[PDB]
Write a protein that binds this ligand. Structure first.
Ligand SMILES: [Mg+2]
Ligand SMILES: [Mg+2]
Ligand SMILES: [Mg+2]
Ligand SMILES: [Mg+2]
Ligand SMILES: [Mg+2]
Ligand SMILES: [Mg+2]
Ligand SMILES: [Mg+2]
Ligand SMILES: [Mg+2]
Ligand SMILES: [Mg+2]
Ligand SMILES: [Mg+2]
Ligand SMILES: [Mg+2]
Ligand SMILES: [Mg+2]
Ligand SMILES: [Mg+2]
Ligand SMILES: [Mg+2]
Ligand SMILES: [Mg+2]
Ligand SMILES: [Mg+2]
Ligand SMILES: [Mg+2]
Ligand SMILES: [Mg+2]
Ligand SMILES: [Mg+2]
Ligand SMILES: [Mg+2]
Ligand SMILES: [Mg+2]
Ligand SMILES: [Mg+2]
Ligand SMILES: [Mg+2]
Ligand SMILES: [Mg+2]
Ligand SMILES: [Mg+2]
Ligand SMILES: [Mg+2]
Ligand SMILES: [Mg+2]
Ligand SMILES: [Mg+2]
Ligand SMILES: [Mg+2]
Ligand SMILES: [Mg+2]
Ligand SMILES: [Mg+2]
Lengths: 121, 233, 56, 252
RNA sequence: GAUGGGGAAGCUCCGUUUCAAAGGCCUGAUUUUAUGCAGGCCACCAUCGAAAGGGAAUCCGGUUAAGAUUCCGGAACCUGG
RNA sequence: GCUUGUGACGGCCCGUGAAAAUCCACAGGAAGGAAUAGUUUUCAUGCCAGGUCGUACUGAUAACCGCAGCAGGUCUCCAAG
RNA sequence: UUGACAUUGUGAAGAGACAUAGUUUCUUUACUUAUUCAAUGAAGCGGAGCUGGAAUUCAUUUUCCACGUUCUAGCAUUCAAGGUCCCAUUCGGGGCUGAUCCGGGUU
């Protein structure tokens, strides 16, 4: 028969079959375990007197936290490790390259109690 | 006739945006497309010398079809046919004491360039087919001259892959015949005679004729009408 | 300010007549009369040059 | 010695055009089907000041003959054109100020601007405020059209070349004294760093052929040959004559 | 300042939409079923570059030895779902 | 009155005094849509969520640069009688 | 900057030799495919045909032009409505025509 009929003047790259990967050997032989578990997200209580005050007055736990951890990973790692409801989490980087979480609990939980339940005092 | 209505459109300059048309003549093709097309044109605007362009004189489809007709009766062995022939001749020879001849003398088309060349030299070919496509044409150009000096009847045939299909290769520069069972001797000389008439006799005359120098029709019509009016005014 | 127009209801961004939040209602009066008169004169332009073709 | 001033300009660091505020590039429409078979209509939507330019520009919008859309061009405002005017552009087009017509299609004596050197270059000749070209004849076989350019030169170009009827707005601009340095300052401020000009005769010889000496003087003939080499050409390059031009000018 | 490219013995130089087959959205098709293909568009063609340019949206009171339009209290507002 | 903000004007130019992101509107009418019950989330109210990095202090006749706790230098806001 | 050689190919008139047969060499001027310059989301190029018509017919056309838009700061988009033929009539959807043929040389 006769020719194609292109109504447009631009030639464009033909839409060709783009095939997914079926590797013949694995990537790295073992998937790396969870790089930031809860026990790595929160590293130490901060028991400075100005912090211990926030426990007694403002119902807040102060934690030294992994630099790699964000506000979400703190809130989750607090609930799992301490069985508490977290209202909100404020963080700041201490002037020695460490992360400080100001973790505030909902009114159900008394921070002071949960503070000498973990042990520090 | 109902609430429907005829409302013809006015595609004249300055109104009614042009409709979609077949711009196939105008598309901006990829360079690889552009190159091969202009390669064919540049190969036609030049004056091509007669030792080339004795090609482009391709054998006609009918004579060719009868040549593919005969040549197919002489394909080489297939994959299974040779392994089948071996065990048939590995058994009957090694025990039945066949003189390495538990198999009949084969008859097939000869192929491969260097193979076919020495066949012509040694005056063993009876009919040589040459493809018209060979891209380093030097692989082939000297064959019409060679066959002519060796009394070997040759034919330039459209299709380097079509010569390849009949020999189980994707392509094949040449295909020739030397052996033919007596049942097909008569059809051969019949084809050879038509073939010699088209090529091997026209050789010396074609050898004197250049080709090409053929204008595109924009410069052709500008020529057919410029010499039309200038002379017959 | 332009991003604030996304925090306000459509009635604050248009008026009820055609070309509401777009043209100043005296231009609309004008692009109406201009439209109507041109379509009228366009009819006049055809049958005049149709009779031209019948007598010329 | 040092590299002299006119040699530094070609590198274009501090000498490139001061371009931020420009309106765009002034150009005739692309020489499409409509313009070279019929004519196309547009409206000058605005005539506007182009920074650093003498002449005002004319924004003229057309319909796109192939897609449903408006496409706007930037013309140079020919004097007399106005907001709301209809501009026609095409082989068959009326000989009215503001329209653009192929040079072949206007009688002799026509006065046009922004004319193309070869057809389609979208405007080459007679663009500065106050200039124009006049057609002085036609050669229908080979369809040339002899014109006279603002310099006085009489070039012959294709009859398909396009020009716009009229002269370019803003004439007489150069009749007013700048009157003071600042006017010239703000002038070249929006063109390029060509101002002010230290005389080569006030520099030391490192700087310029004219530099040095215990008195301020050129020292040798200031007429420099065409064959002179970069760093030599300063003064009156290839001057075929010199001195106060007395007597009537006006090429014969 | 990458890129198809073009220079250069070469470190590298040039070009930035540049003589390049340059790319992605809406939803329909599915009721093996997950995303292959059936439409139609867009030919826009990297990216870096402003803690004074452009720019979604917060306030007052209280509070520390040292923090606050960021904490507390009360009262809002924007954006996405 | 003073500082600042803003308005409607007026003077000036051979100077006529950025860009993009982003947001809205209109033109358009593709389509989808109710009587035994539909369309509606640019009206009200209600639900969830909002990460990452900076945030101390000095800013100068002592926290900056001038070998220094140097009569030098170093951008700016607020401004009582 | 100037010359020669190479990139360098195709015609025609005009000069030049074995000494007034065409191989060859130049001067003049044509050709387009090398080479060069521009333009464009490579859009309408070239040739022919339709219909009109200036044209005068020296047998019937020998030709040449044309061959959708100009009072107005509107409107122009859904492969187009219309027309025609199909799917087996659904709601949808297609072909042709509208928009003349031919050559794929983007100009
Ligand atoms: Mg923070
Ligand atoms: Mg030097
Ligand atoms: Mg520049
Ligand atoms: Mg200066
Ligand atoms: Mg001076
Ligand atoms: Mg001077
Ligand atoms: Mg001096
Ligand atoms: Mg010197
Ligand atoms: Mg000198
Ligand atoms: Mg001197
Ligand atoms: Mg002097
Ligand atoms: Mg680069
Ligand atoms: Mg950035
Ligand atoms: Mg900023
Ligand atoms: Mg800013
Ligand atoms: Mg306070
Ligand atoms: Mg505190
Ligand atoms: Mg403080
Ligand atoms: Mg609060
Ligand atoms: Mg509240
Ligand atoms: Mg919301
Ligand atoms: Mg002030
Ligand atoms: Mg102004
Ligand atoms: Mg708005
Ligand atoms: Mg709402
Ligand atoms: Mg995210
Ligand atoms: Mg502070
Ligand atoms: Mg101090
Ligand atoms: Mg000091
Ligand atoms: Mg020469
Ligand atoms: Mg083009």
């Amino acid at each position: 028969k006769a020719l194609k009929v292109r109504t447009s003047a631009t030639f464009r790259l033909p839409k060709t079959l783009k095939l997914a990967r079926a590797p013949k050997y694995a990537s790295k032989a073992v998937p790396h375990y969870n790089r930031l578990d809860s026990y790595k997200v929160i590293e130490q209580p901060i028991t400075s007197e100005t912090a211990m005050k926030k426990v007694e007055d403002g119902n807040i736990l102060v934690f030294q936290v992994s630099m790699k951890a964000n506000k979400y990973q703190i809130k989750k790692a607090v609930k799992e490790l301490y069985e508490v409801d977290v209202l909100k989490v404020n963080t700041l980087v201490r002037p020695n390259g460490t992360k400080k979480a100001y973790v505030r609990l909902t009114a159900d939980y008394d921070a002071l109690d949960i503070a000498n339940r973990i042990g520090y005092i | 006739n109902p609430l429907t209505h005829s409302t013809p459109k006015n595609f004249g300059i300055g109104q009614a945006v042009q409709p979609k048309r077949n711009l196939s003549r105008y598309v901006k093709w990829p360079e690889y497309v552009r190159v091969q097309r202009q390669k064919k044109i540049l190969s036609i605007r030049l004056k091509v010398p007669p030792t080339i362009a004795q090609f482009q004189y391709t054998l006609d489809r009918n004579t060719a079809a009868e040549t593919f007709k005969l040549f197919n009766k002489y394909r080489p062995e297939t994959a299974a046919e040779k392994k089948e022939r071996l065990t048939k001749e590995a058994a009957a020879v090694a025990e039945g004491k066949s003189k390495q001849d538990a198999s009949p003398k084969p008859y097939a088309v000869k192929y491969g360039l260097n193979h076919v060349v020495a066949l012509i030299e040694n005056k063993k070919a009876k009919l040589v087919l040459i493809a018209n496509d060979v891209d380093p044409i030097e692989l082939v150009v000297f064959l019409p001259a060679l066959c002519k000096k060796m009394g070997v009847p040759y034919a330039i045939v459209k299709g380097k892959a079509r010569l390849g299909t009949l020999v189980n290769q994707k392509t094949s520069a040449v295909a020739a015949l030397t052996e033919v069972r007596a049942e097909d001797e008569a059809a051969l000389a019949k084809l050879v005679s038509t073939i010699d008439a088209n090529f091997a006799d026209k050789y010396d005359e074609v050898k004197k004729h250049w080709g090409g120098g053929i204008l595109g029709n924009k410069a052709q019509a500008k020529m057919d009408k410029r010499a039309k009016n200038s002379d017959s005014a | 300010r332009p991003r604030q127009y996304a925090t306000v209801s459509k009635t604050h961004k248009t008026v009820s007549r055609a070309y509401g939040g777009s043209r100043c209602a005296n231009c609309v009066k004008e692009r109406i009369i201009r439209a109507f008169l041109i379509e009228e004169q366009k009819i006049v332009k055809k049958v005049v040059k149709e009779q031209t073709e019948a007598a010329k | 010695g040092r590299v002299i001033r006119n040699q530094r300009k070609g590198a274009g660091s501090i000498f490139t055009s001061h371009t931020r505020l420009r309106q765009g590039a002034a150009k005739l429409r692309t020489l499409d089907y409509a313009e070279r078979h019929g004519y196309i209509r547009g409206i000058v939507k605005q005539i506007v000041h182009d920074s650093g330019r003498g002449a005002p520009l004319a924004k003229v919008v057309f319909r796109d003959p192939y897609k449903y859309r408006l496409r706007e061009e930037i013309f140079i405002a020919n004097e007399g054109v106005h907001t709301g005017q209809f501009i026609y552009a095409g082989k068959k087009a009326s000989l009215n100020v503001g329209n653009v017509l192929p040079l072949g299609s206007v009688p002799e004596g026509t006065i046009v601007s922004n004319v193309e050197e070869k057809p389609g270059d979208r405007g080459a000749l007679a663009r500065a405020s106050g200039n124009y070209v006049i057609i002085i004849g036609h050669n229908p076989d080979e369809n040339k059209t002899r014109v006279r350019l603002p310099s006085g030169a009489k070039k012959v170009i294709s009859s398909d070349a396009r020009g716009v009827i009229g002269v370019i707005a803003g004439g007489g601009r150069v009749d007013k004294p700048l009157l003071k340095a600042g006017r010239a300052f703000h002038k070249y401020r929006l063109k390029r760093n060509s101002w002010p000009k230290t005389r080569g005769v006030a520099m030391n010889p490192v700087d310029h052929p004219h530099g040095g000496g215990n008195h301020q003087h050129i020292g040798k003939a200031s007429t420099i040959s065409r064959g002179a080499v970069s760093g030599q050409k300063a003064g009156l390059i290839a001057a075929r004559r010199t001195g106060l031009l007395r007597g009537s000018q006006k090429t014969q």
